[PDB]
DNA sequence: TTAGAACAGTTTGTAACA
DNA sequence: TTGTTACAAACTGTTCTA
């Protein structure tokens, strides 16, 4: 079962250097290029499936970084 | 003055049973009339303003229960 | 004055190009 | 095979009708 992992979505292929679904790699891009600061309203440690991916975009781009995503040099 | 009880926007009125914005008025109906049960990806504490707000729906619609919005009466 | 619908813009996600 | 990017749908918020 080849699977995202940041959300558990099915993914789709290894994307900027980490298994993740379509989803999660374009948020990626678009998060980690983006001029707009991500606050999280808890904790920062909220959790990512693939129901409730959209609720926090700080949560969620901090854990494509600790997959090892990368925007490749 | 006129603050959103919910997330602290500039209140349009009171909507449904209390003083909230245009935006909270609206997620509150079709949150409360919708079928989608909605679960904080948290600890149920996320801070609702108008920056976050539509980060956890389920926090805001606990914080809109607990501001006296409510359908008809 | 506000509830309710419709419109519009924002955001997220999919599919397709190279 | 994957990175951009465009296309599409989902979603939140605004304006408007009663
Ligand atoms: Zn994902
Ligand atoms: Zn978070
Ligand atoms: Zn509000
Ligand atoms: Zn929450």
């Given amino acids: 079962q080849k699977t995202c992992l ?3 979505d099915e993914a789709s292929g290894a ?3 980490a ?3 379509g989803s999660c790699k374009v948020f990626f ?4 290029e983006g001029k707009q600061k991500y606050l ?3 904790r920062n440690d909220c959790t990512i499936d693939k129901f409730r991916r959209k ?3 700080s949560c ?3 854990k494509c970084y600790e997959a090892g995503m990368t925007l490749g040099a």
């Fill in 29 to 32: 891009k678009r998060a980690a």
């Fill in 55 to 57: 609720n926090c975009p």
């Fill in 15 to 17: 994307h900027y250097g």
């Fill in 19 to 21: 298994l993740t679904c």
């Fill in 60 to 62: 969620r781009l901090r």
């Fill in 6 to 8: 940041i959300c558990g």
């Fill in 40 to 42: 999280c309203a808890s």
